[model samples]
Target: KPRDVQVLPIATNTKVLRARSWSRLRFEIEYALERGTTSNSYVIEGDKTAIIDPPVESFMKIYLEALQQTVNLKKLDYVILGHFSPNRIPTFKALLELAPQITFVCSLPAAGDLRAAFPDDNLNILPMRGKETLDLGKGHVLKFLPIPSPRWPAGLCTYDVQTQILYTDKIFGAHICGDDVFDESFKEDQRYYFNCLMAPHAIHVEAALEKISDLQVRLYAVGHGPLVRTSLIALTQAYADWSKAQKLEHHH
Candidate 1:
């Protein structure tokens, strides 16, 4: 089952591979969502090449082929993880087979999970703790945000200085797939995904929202659905409102 790999240029040095699908894949924590999902992985070509959050194992066939043709994996220096899940391990392993020199950038908890996953292997880890910047050369400095939730304990997000694109791993995301790279139609779908995944951790969500409030984000390269460029400010405000409502509605 080869899935389609969509390549969209969101920023100057950033290209997004949207592994889209109209199927509900593996998830244990939430259930209110039945909408199709788009697993977005970012390929950043600065002076150093880096890949961010490869799609699940199911999309490996298409993902790898597209990746190989897209960039020189041997020269790939960094592999960033938004969150760690056992389901994505196979894809990560496949990446290693091609580019063994790639260093992993993840949160502290995610570093533990990766260590456990590859106990015998020597994994180069740069575990961030809410404060760290990786200068990927070419004026592309990335800032990390450690946004943890019950559903995603190892949640991390990145913001690029050059492009002003916020690589939000899973924070403001939806489950729908579309041809348009930027979301215009179904804001409800985005809110639906929020309710199922982020509603439980409203405090952390709000905290993270505040954490990245000052970033000059031109586009939000989210984990799923469309790249939020046109509706950036609106969606940010919506996330605040939705999160507040979730806390208020559930705490009763």
Candidate 2:
């Protein structure tokens, strides 16, 4: 049973395709929250069209169909993956079938998985380690930030210079499903989400926060829930505060 996927506009030429579910997902936090999840995948229709973090396999068909309606499949130039999960191979293969020339951008660790999965294929791998930028033309210069953790060993985030939107892979995200794309009103749901998903990796979270602080970000195009557009600074501060408190409470 496939659900209808919705594409919502974000910035100048960027949008997100959100796949929502009524039941909780299989992730650890999902089991705890008992809340349905939203998987957000971004599309940048710049000088060279690019896809970022396609949803899990469950949303492949609908996502592709909905994406086809907006983006030219033949002209899809890049597929940027913030994290690599083995389960997503099928979705990647399907997208490859549609856009064979889609070069991949991911972290170095993720590159290993890519090579392992497609041994014989010659993949154009743009592996980012620390600070790297990709000029997607039309002022869509993108910056990369690596935020690896125990769960997501190859985690990464992307920042669009022109739009000032940070494509945060697994950072500052919530699983609650809704029609709203950006979470303007702060809720305890996001705090619960952070405590469960990000608290354990407080050190890594701090590192990620510091590394990305230089960017002039306006909206956080996160991987789940609503984009943090209205309270970007507050959310960042909350993450920092919560992470510090978690570290102090756990260690001391």
Candidate 3:
């Protein structure tokens, strides 16, 4: 198996890559590949293979295939649900069918959402506390930071410290309309993402920004738009301005 990526161009910058299925937060803005929607998912293999944030129903094939492409269909170790949002949970039923062994790791509220949605055998949900470290062995560890919000009461952020990449759940994020998932390449899309997803949570994000600012992050591997590998400081600054409802010199 190749340690490479397979991108399914769902929208402009958004795509249901063999695994990264996050097309965007909205569907009417003009960036979705098919439904004006986008999702993001990841599979990291250090010791245990963990799939992070699989998208909702529409891109089932992309989701199913991405998992199959990585490992035996019957042996999926786990699937971490960054949220139980419709965009991220609708396919949970289908995913449960496809990968029964796929344990769901989510925030406390997400567990309730899943139970409410399914009502019966809603799948096992692992409640995550902030700062919990998931050691994948070989020096790869994923830290789950509970940055709770209206998005979900138990909101969390996944960071692969080794990658300096933050797997954020729609906070300092955006959704681009192309195949490139890098922020510097899709800056405009980022603005669109912020407006769509974080606009409501701007204030919350402000306090979160202070927490996020302390870290010298290089890659904003956001859950909404492209993988922000550069301009993270700029993104940080942008978040500060955006959260305060302050305008950036360039946004207007």
Total backbone collisions for each predicted model: 1, 0, 18
Off by over 4 Å in 1: 27-35
Residue ranges of candidate 3 with Cα displaced over 4 Å: 1-5, 8-38, 246-252
User: In model 1, how large is the Cα lDDT of residue 96?
Assistant: 81
| Lowest-sum lDDT 10-residue window in model 1 | 26-35
**Residue 84 alpha-carbon offset, candidate 1, angstroms:** 0.8
**Ten-residue region with minimum lDDT total, candidate 2:** 27-36
Models, CA RMSD each? 1.9, 1.8, 6.1
Candidate 1 accuracy as TM-score? 0.94
TM-score of each model, paired residue for residue? 0.94, 0.94, 0.79
**Candidate 2: where is the Cα deviation over 4 Å?**
184-186
User: What lDDT, from 0 to 1, does candidate 2 have?
Assistant: 0.85
